[PDB]
Amino acid sequence: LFSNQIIWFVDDTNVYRVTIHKTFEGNLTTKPINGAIFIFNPRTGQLFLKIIHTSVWAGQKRLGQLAKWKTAEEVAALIRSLPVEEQPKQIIVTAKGMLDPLEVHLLDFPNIVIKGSELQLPFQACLKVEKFGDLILKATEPQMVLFNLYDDWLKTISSYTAFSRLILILRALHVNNDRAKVILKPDKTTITEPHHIWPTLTDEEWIKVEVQLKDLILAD
Ligand SMILES: [Cl-]
Ligand SMILES: [Cl-]
Ligand SMILES: [Cl-]
Numbered sequence: 428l429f430s431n432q433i434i435w436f437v438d439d440t441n442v443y444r445v446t447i448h449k450t451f452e453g454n455l456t457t458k459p460i461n462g463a464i465f466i467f468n469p470r471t472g473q474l475f476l477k478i479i480h481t482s483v484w485a486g487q488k489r490l491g492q493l494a495k496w497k498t499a500e501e502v503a504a505l506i507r508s509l510p511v512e513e514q515p516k517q518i519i520v521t522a523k524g525m526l527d528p529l530e531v532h533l534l535d536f537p538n539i540v541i542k543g544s545e546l547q548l549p550f551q552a553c554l555k556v557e558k559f560g561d562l563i564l565k566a567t568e569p570q571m572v573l574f575n576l577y578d579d580w581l582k583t584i585s586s587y588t589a590f591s592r593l594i595l596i597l598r599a600l601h602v603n604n605d606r607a608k609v610i611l612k613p614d615k616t617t618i619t620e621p622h623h624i625w626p627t628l629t630d631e632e633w634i635k636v637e638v639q640l641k642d643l644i645l646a647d
Contacts, residue, residue, distance in 0.1 A: 472577030
């Protein structure tokens with residue numbers, strides 16, 4: 428996972444999003460809201476966030492199915508925009524419905540291996556992190572935004588350790604957002620830098636946090 432080969436995880440979970448409301452007449456209305464594709468490099472921490480504006484669905488039906496195809500289209504478009512040296516060698520998807528769309532969209536890229544995964548990597552949780560949630564909510568058109576999901580961690584820990592830390596954060600936020608946010612703020616003075624995603628914590632603080640997040644996930 429952290430070798431010389433560029434690897435991307437691709438998450439389509441958040442592409443097609445809706446709000447459901449029961450009207451005064453007793454029927455359900457379903458209205459799309461903006462979504463996002465998450466494309467993540469586990470070695471470097473790079474995230475490509477492709478915001479999906481609701482206008483893309485105009486006209487269309489079976490939007491949850493079409494979202495798999497839209498995701499594959501956008502992955503291919505990103506790849507086309509990158510020099511060959513920056514293109515991934517492997518694309519890993521935790522949703523099985525992404526496999527066939529990606530295969531058909533990436534026929535011009537014979538070097539790229541597509542595989543499925545049973546890992547729990549819930550980028551959905553990022554919608555709970557104000558930076559991402561508000562950006563996605565308020566967008567008025569599609570756009571791509573770059574992030575570094577490991578902040579400054581790699582100065583002192585390995586990619587393996589950083590990946591493990593990130594997964595514990597995402598899973599804990601997914602399972603119990605309120606308690607995870609408390610765990611991640613151990614002191615009144617804990618802050619997150621404006622250009623960071625996650626709090627600035629000491630090594631001792633991260634040790635305790637990681638154990639607490641793991642325990643939270645186990646308690647579900
Ligand atoms: Cl884009
Ligand atoms: Cl490593
Ligand atoms: Cl989870």
